[PDB]
Design a protein around this ligand. Structure first.
Ligand SMILES: [Cl-]
Ligand SMILES: [Cl-]
Ligand SMILES: [Cl-]
Ligand SMILES: [Cu+2]
Ligand SMILES: [Cu+2]
Ligand SMILES: [Cu+2]
Ligand SMILES: [Cu+2]
Ligand SMILES: [Cu+2]
Ligand SMILES: [Cu+2]
Lengths: 334, 334, 334
């Protein structure tokens, strides 16, 4: 009985970090409590001042990543403050019933609600807002994130050998549909509601104006780069709640990848580029062997370099000439 | 020798149903006879009167699902009545040789032909019309469906345990390319031939005007919902002959999924969203644990909610508070 | 130590052929030497005179396929002749570190460089040019190809049985973004640099004007068809460095397919259509059972038949009536 099980209260952290957690654990099922507060706000999404009338869980795109173990129960309190304009809810792809919880979490501004569900399937799963009649708008405006349900004994390779990571990063990729006026410039809206009609028209073209990691062009580049060192194993969680993407680590690989994101299935190894289906989260493990600045991107290179779907990983350590060596540097042709 | 084998005559039924069949069977190879009759007709495809100059097998989009077992021979008589305007044929992705049968089944209006092939590979396979020089037009206008070749001993999980379904549903998803006039309204054509030029121009933009399950926006919603009950296992067959899609069951999962659709391969479990490659059919098993109205949709939510790629499943039974419980209903924030 | 290992100098051949090589080999690790020379040139890409200001490795789209075995070291000399206008480099997805080698191979016109890396992961891997700030333009203009790293003991099925091919073909699929003028006709540019601005604008629409195999509409059709005979096993290598595709053999199958392209993973069997993620190369084995002309295409049939992503395979041999037979030829309906 879930009512009898012990409870824990997890504190969420902002992407791209993931709140501390055990991988393999000796604990039995618990009811893990989370709270998220919805924030509608106007956000600058590129380096030329373009704005999005955005909607978020906890003020971030993506929302924070929630981590539990298979057999736990997720107990979320969802808060929609009176300062917001729209109704909201939450659909957990990791949950069973009632449209993922959406039917049980409809909160108008000034309201909150608490949902419990059993996390009985391991994997990374999208959660997103889904208010009746407004679903794609709320999703593309920023209302999604990841629930990671780890196996109780941690991640395993296809032969059952234990796989372990030193840190986890969470990347949410957002296809944005920002309207333009007759002058060809992006529109700037005074309120969230005023953006709706024009945005739906752009959405229907199926052509994003921007595709961004974690809420903005360059959100994870230069100074905001993810970090690691040679010998470190990272888990890269990638969510896309609305549209396909194809992650790639430039100069690296997916050592073990669950592209459909479900840990009871064997991962694939040595991937150059993997595939996250729109409406899902997937995960890749990589152990760094070389130092330097890597790019992590959507390998539609137009989507990456022109539209914004690219970040960096800065990696410290010693160079390995066995793996790669410049034999002859750029020089005149003889 | 196939000429010596016994014959059966299957009666096809309209989607979303699939004609009755055995899963595991004790019978040996048979020549299974089918007949399909092509119907060109003008169909209303949305709730605002938009029409498609459509082309169908048996009057439906998709055409009916044909079901045989591995080792059987499919013997199809394809009829093109004199009331039709165009030539047609059939390409079975489940068949080997002669462009899937297309080269052997070219029928002008007033003609019919009979094709036999060995169904020697298990899986769900697209069949579609493919007249030389007219292939994509006939496909996007509605001429596709599924051939399901079941293993003789039924479906199996990755460890070889038997998997069984209580009912099968077939969903064909159709990316439509309906032209517009200078006034921005969809064009209405007096004849099939008159629609061709304008439609090709829309096709070349790679942007569907509509994306519909089973021939129309809302074809499987509200009153036309698929049905099931708690404890029932359903097989959801999903075909897309021209364009990728990403099926998702809201509030459910793919318990076992063959997204590439070929039953000799191990399925994946616990999928939130799967991927049907354009030019293929895939299949998912799910056993319902919760009652209520589910949505089954393409999880590009714009494609689903704006363009039409969404249906419903109404499920009877008793609610399970262990799996999901509303702890605190929507109420004022303290 | 790689410095001590023996060296070999491979001679590359033009697509769609792949240079001769052993599959299973008794040799140990070697340093395999290759040279490629970059050629910028204006190429006609369709049957109506449309031109692309193209960029190539070795004068071909795709660049030639390089073949080594797991454990070998690839040692490439990359030459950028003074007759070229732009800087170039190379990023090997099969390599570890320095952005796949791009950071170590920056060559201006008149320069060359030599890169070594360990091919320690089996599979087909994209290589492509990636000059800082110019990456997608160089890729979509033609600068990609495949590195195939074979397992030392050859290809294996999921149960470890040996798989062998009689010939290998390499198909590079190129999404092209050719600008149009106010008159609706494709633009023709005097120089490569003059094409840049207009091309970037088309790229940003995410809608290719053409999608071609091996550099041109019809590059592998009619007289340029791939060839085989009944009983022959072919490996079909398919690369797409920028955009997804979904290969299909009309009248055939993928007997064994590594759609993510990495040979340490078990292949899938009996595929009708597979999926190459943009930024990757995959591979399919097929043994021909029927003679005739097959089509090999991207099964978005608009992309294939309207935009150019289709080729042919002409297959000699004896027809098999067991696999497929015309029972009744096209004739009047009784
Ligand atoms: Cl890249
Ligand atoms: Cl959804
Ligand atoms: Cl086809
Ligand atoms: Cu919302
Ligand atoms: Cu969803
Ligand atoms: Cu037809
Ligand atoms: Cu086909
Ligand atoms: Cu270049
Ligand atoms: Cu790349």
């Amino acid at each position: 009985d879930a009512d009898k099980l012990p409870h824990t209260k997890v504190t969420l952290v902002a992407p791209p970090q993931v709140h501390p957690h055990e991988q393999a654990t000796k604990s039995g099922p618990k009811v893990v409590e989370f709270t998220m507060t919805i924030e509608e706000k106007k956000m600058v999404i590129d380096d030329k001042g373009t704005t999005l009338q955005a909607m978020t869980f906890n003020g971030s795109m993506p929302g924070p990543t929630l981590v539990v173990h298979e057999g736990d129960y997720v107990q979320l309190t969802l808060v929609n403050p009176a300062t917001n304009a729209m109704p909201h809810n939450v659909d957990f792809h990791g949950a069973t019933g009632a449209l993922g919880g959406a039917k049980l979490t409809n909160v108008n501004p000034g309201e909150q609600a608490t949902l419990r569900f059993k996390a009985d399937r391991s994997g990374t799963f999208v959660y997103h807002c889904a208010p009746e009649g407004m679903v794609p708008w709320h999703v593309v405006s920023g209302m999604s994130g990841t629930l990671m349900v780890l196996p109780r004994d941690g991640l395993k390779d296809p032969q059952g050998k234990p796989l372990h990571y030193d840190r986890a990063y969470t990347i949410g990729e957002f296809d944005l549909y920002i309207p333009k006026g007759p002058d060809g410039k992006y529109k700037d809206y005074a309120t969230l509601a005023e953006s709706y009609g024009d945005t739906v028209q752009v959405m229907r073209t199926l052509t994003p104006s921007h595709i961004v990691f974690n809420g903005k062009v360059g959100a994870l580049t230069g100074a905001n780069a993810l970090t690691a060192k040679v010998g470190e194993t990272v888990l890269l969680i990638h969510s896309q709640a609305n549209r396909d993407t194809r992650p790639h680590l430039i100069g690296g690989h997916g050592d073990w990848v669950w592209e459909t994101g479900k840990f009871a299935n064997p991962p694939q190894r040595d991937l150059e580029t993997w595939f996250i289906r729109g409406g899902s989260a997937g995960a890749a493990l990589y152990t760094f062997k070389q130092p330097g600045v890597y790019a992590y991107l959507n390998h539609n290179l137009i989507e990456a370099f022109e539209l914004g779907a690219a970040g960096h990983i800065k990696v410290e350590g010693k160079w390995n000439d066995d793996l790669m060596k410049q034999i002859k540097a750029p020089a005149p042709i003889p």
